[PDB]
Amino acid sequence: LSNDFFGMEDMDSLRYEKFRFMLKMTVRSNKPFRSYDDVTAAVSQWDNSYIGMVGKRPFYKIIALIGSSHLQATPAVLADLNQPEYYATLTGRCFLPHRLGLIPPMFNVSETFRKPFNIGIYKGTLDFTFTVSDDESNEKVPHVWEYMNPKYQSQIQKEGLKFGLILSKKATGTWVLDQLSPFK
């Protein structure tokens, strides 16, 4: 029931970077996550080690955060309460406001990350496929934050820090990726 556990709804200077993305994210855990901050802790472990495209890493972190908010438990947890699995898929186009400087062009090639996670009470695996590329079309786009599940939109700044994202909203009108943490 959505009341006790996360993801059970289904069961029941400054630059703007314009990009498009696709994500497919699977999380497999030993026990069902009780809350969204348990989920983000697990998901955030995806790049504890990283050999993907250097220039894409910030965008991957961002869409991993966004995508996490959409994770939903599959029936795996009803077959076996001890084999919880969660899935999310999302595609979009948007602006990322950031202070990271010039971003080299990004091409339409996917990268897959398959990694363990261990956050104490919870442990398991992550299987993420991300695609991020420049969006050259003339269609108008939202800010990336508009793709966050509204249920969890209020938790953006705090949960972002788990991903190494230092986000602020001081007099800009929108969340800005001010910097990436050297510690994560």
Residue numbers in the entry: 41 to 52, 58 to 229
Please give me the paper's original passages concerning this structure.
To further investigate the role of the N terminus and hydrophobic surface-exposed loop and to investigate the structural conservation of M across Rhabdoviridae, we solved the structures of full-length M from VSV serotype New Jersey (VSVNJ) and from the lyssavirus Lagos bat virus (LBV).
The structure of VSVNJ M was solved by SeMet single-wavelength anomalous dispersion phasing and refined to 1.83 Å resolution with residuals R/Rfree = 0.157/0.179. VSVNJ M forms a globular domain with a central α helix sandwiched on one side by an extensive 5-stranded β sheet and on the other by two α helices and a smaller two-stranded β sheet that is very similar to the thermolysin-resistant core of M (Mth) from VSV serotype Indiana (VSVInd), with 0.9 Å root-mean-squared displacement (rmsd) over 156 Cα atoms. Residues 121–128, disordered in the VSVInd Mth structure, are observed in the structure of VSVNJ M with residues 121–124 forming a short stretch of α helix (α2.5). The N-terminal 57 residues of VSVNJ M do not form part of this globular domain. F46 is central to the interaction: the side chain of F46 sits deep in the hydrophobic pocket lined by the side chains of residues Y81, V84, L116, Y131, Y197 and the backbone between residues 114 and 116. Overall, these interactions bury 1050 Å2 of surface area. The interaction of the globular domain with the N-terminal peptide of an adjacent molecule in the crystal gives rise to non-covalently linked linear polymers of VSVNJ M monomers. In VSVNJ M this loop has shifted toward the interacting N-terminal residues: the Cα atom of K196 moves 9.5 Å from its position in VSVInd Mth and residues 195–200 form a stretch of 3–10 helix. Our structure reveals that the Rae-1 binding site on VSV M partially overlaps with the N-terminal self-association motif.
